[PDB]
């Protein structure tokens, strides 16, 4: 029976391949070629933010596009004011091995995680006057990679034991567990309407999941090695990914296929981050050759380089109004470009 | 103004706190601990605690002599290894009276030639000498590998072959390989592991003075 099931699986794979092939009539290289090229883009450091004692692993813009959280390897979580280069908060942690951070939409809580397989949730507004830990969520087996709030009482975690989970803060339990991968999990992004989310998982395969139901809906392939970053276009029906083979691609769900392949012949270092712009016209990226590249998302051509770092770039992000951009790298400095 | 002016104080105080933590961050000695021999690891840690007094990650903290020491002792380990680029030395423990020696050698080769470990030194422990001495008293011969001289010899011709077998496989060397045969005298282990790091830091300081 097992061999019969394998034959059925092969037939189903052939079905999927044929259905995908039946989709493409117009390639994007024959439509986006006639648009006006953006030309030259270049911007300069306005504010430089110093103070971290070691490498920088994550950052996240606020909901008002003015405050900033940052997580470093020394065990510190700093809250900055990006206008006057002021330090608003400095939070110390219990584990020194940290790999992610998040900023709650309402502005009351932050989150962190790392190699201790625990996700910690902090309260920023208290009557006594100091930042104190509110919840300590546990139950995974490997380390965490990314965490992303939805409301003030629901959080999502992904861990490199092939696992994802949805936690209800106040109760403290797992409302749903998502399984189906084979290797670790590296990155996930949430939708603007906040009903679905996507994750890439270190085996050249990416998945779209729904939270209200609980099943795994869609799968995509195409890469030759593991996946390092994933992000949503600003309408909830696209996403962009970059791998450790020094290649980036764009996926849409209804087309169920890839469209662009942003590549070059002189680049041999993999990706570490991605993020979009407001109108979906600039795709930023961080590499290991010490640069931050600026692609035009519709042509796979080149638009700019934000050079200026003395080591590898780890994280980058965009405000909620489009004015500013922020980057952070292994040299312990974090820069604001406009 | 007149209320965007206490914020400046607050920022300066936070800056002062971080600026006083920098120095203590820079004085610390971080050692990573690897091997397939759990009994040796347990014994060595117990002895280290005795000297100092005079799951996840399990960090142990010590003070050898006015210096702070941290030992970490944690299939896709290459992703895990990103966080260990600020360490000073890797301590590899191997059983000698064993076979699984080829397995240990393969693991050694996989660990050493890594891009992240271009500026870390390696300390090698070859343990369980008493069993090897007893089992060479009634000597059991080697395998088909070219043990050129004195196949059923005393330990003086087997130790050299083993240390030479491990010494190679360092394709990008740039540094020496310290080695040691573990003894039941605790102070010997403490002294050797304190000497290795001292030599490493002298080796780094003579590059700014152009040897």
């Amino acid at each position: 029976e097992l061999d019969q099931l394998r034959q059925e699986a092969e037939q189903l794979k052939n079905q999927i391949r044929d259905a995908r092939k039946a989709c493409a009539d117009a390639t994007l290289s024959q439509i986006t070629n006639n648009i006006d090229p953006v030309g030259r883009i270049q911007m300069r450091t306005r504010r430089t933010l110093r103070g971290h004692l070691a490498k920088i692993y994550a950052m996240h813009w606020g909901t008002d596009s003015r405050l900033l959280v940052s997580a470093s390897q020394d065990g510190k979580l700093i809250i900055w004011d990006s206008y006057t280069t002021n330090k608003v908060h400095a939070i110390p942690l219990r584990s020194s091995w940290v790999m992610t951070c998040a900023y709650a939409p309402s502005g009351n809580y932050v989150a962190c995680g790392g190699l201790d397989n625990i996700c910690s949730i902090y309260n920023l507004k208290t009557r006594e006057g100091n930042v104190r830990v509110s919840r300590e969520l546990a139950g995974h087996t490997g380390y965490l990679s990314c965490c992303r709030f939805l409301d003030d009482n629901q959080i999502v975690t992904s861990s490199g034991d092939t696992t994802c989970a949805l936690w209800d803060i106040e109760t403290g339990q797992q409302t749903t567990t998502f399984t189906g991968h084979t290797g670790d999990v590296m990155s996930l992004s949430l939708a603007p309407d906040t009903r679905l989310f996507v994750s890439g998982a270190c085996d050249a395969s990416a998945k779209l999941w729904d939270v209200r139901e609980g099943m795994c809906r869609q799968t995509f392939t195409g890469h030759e090695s593991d996946i390092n970053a994933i992000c949503f276009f600003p309408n909830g029906n696209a996403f962009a990914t970059g791998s450790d083979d020094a290649t980036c691609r764009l996926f849409d769900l209804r087309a169920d296929q890839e469209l662009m392949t942003y590549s070059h012949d002189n680049i041999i270092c993999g990706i570490t981050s991605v993020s979009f712009s407001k109108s979906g016209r600039l795709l930023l990226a961080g590499y290991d050759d010490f640069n931050c590249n600026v692609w035009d998302a519709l042509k796979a051509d080149r638009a700019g380089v934000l050079a200026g770092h003395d080591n590898r770039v780890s994280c980058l992000g965009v405000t909620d109004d489009g004015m500013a951009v922020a980057t952070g790298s292994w040299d312990s400095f974090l820069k604001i470009w406009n | 103004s007149a209320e965007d002016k206490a914020a400046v104080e607050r920022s300066k105080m936070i800056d002062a706190l971080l600026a006083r933590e920098r120095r203590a961050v820079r004085r610390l000695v971080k050692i990573l601990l690897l091997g397939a021999d759990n009994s040796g690891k347990s014994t060595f840690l117990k002895q280290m605690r005795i000297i100092h007094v005079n799951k996840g990650i399990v960090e142990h903290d010590f003070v050898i002599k006015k210096i702070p020491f941290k030992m970490v002792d944690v299939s896709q380990r290459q992703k895990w290894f990103q966080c260990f680029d600020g360490i000073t030395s890797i301590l590899f423990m191997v059983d000698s009276s064993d076979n699984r020696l080829v397995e240990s050698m393969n693991d050694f080769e996989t660990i050493v030639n890594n891009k992240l470990f271009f500026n870390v030194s390696i300390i090698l422990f070859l343990n369980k000498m008493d069993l090897l001495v007893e089992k060479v008293k009634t000597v059991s011969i080697k395998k088909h590998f070219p043990d050129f001289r004195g196949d059923p010899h005393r330990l003086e011709d087997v130790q050299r072959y083993l240390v030479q077998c491990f010494d190679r496989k360092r394709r990008n060397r740039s540094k020496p390989l310290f080695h040691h045969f573990t003894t039941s005298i605790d102070t010997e282990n403490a002294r050797f592991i304190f000497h290795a790091v001292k030599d490493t830091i002298l080796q780094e300081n003579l590059k700014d003075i152009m040897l």
Partner: single-chain antibody
Amino acid sequence: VQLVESGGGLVQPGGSRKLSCSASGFAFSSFGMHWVRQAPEKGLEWVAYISSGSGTIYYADTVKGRFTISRDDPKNTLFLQMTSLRSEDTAMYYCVRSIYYYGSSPFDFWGQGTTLTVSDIVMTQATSSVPVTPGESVSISCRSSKSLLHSNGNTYLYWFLQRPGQSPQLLIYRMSNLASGVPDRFSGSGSGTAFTLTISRLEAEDVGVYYCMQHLEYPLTFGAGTKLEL
């Protein structure tokens, strides 16, 4: 949260006093502190300020050089030392908490103060007595003598409340925002140098006197206050 003060009493001409304040229930080392005064039947008036880290110290013009402020962190205690007091120093004194980072809400907590007895921008209060009955929507006005807006978009001004027999309580900070522990029926707005607080669906326990402060730059100045009746 608790601020408890001690030191009041009766004194002769000359003399001296040392008033103390003990804080319990919160983090003292991250806050700035103010001493504020009140005449027996008149409005409030600001006295002195000592900040976090024991750096900036500000005094008032009418007692400067006679009073002294100090703080002790490990024991969580404030002191004010007063010397050579005349007959116009009879009043009641209160201790106030504040913190200044982005988004902060100063003047949130107040103490209970002590009695002491002995043998610049200008704001104006329109009236002193306005009679109303429950269910009536009311509005109360204050005036000033300069723009309180700033090039960073702020607008510094405060409405506080004081019921019949208690200590004050923050109603509206920075002329537009609302504090914690207060109902949602309060609001307030105005143009440069002329403004009004709106109270809707008026019920009981709103009787008392209302106060309007400014905080554009030291010194800090008060008004007279409007007293309501029911």
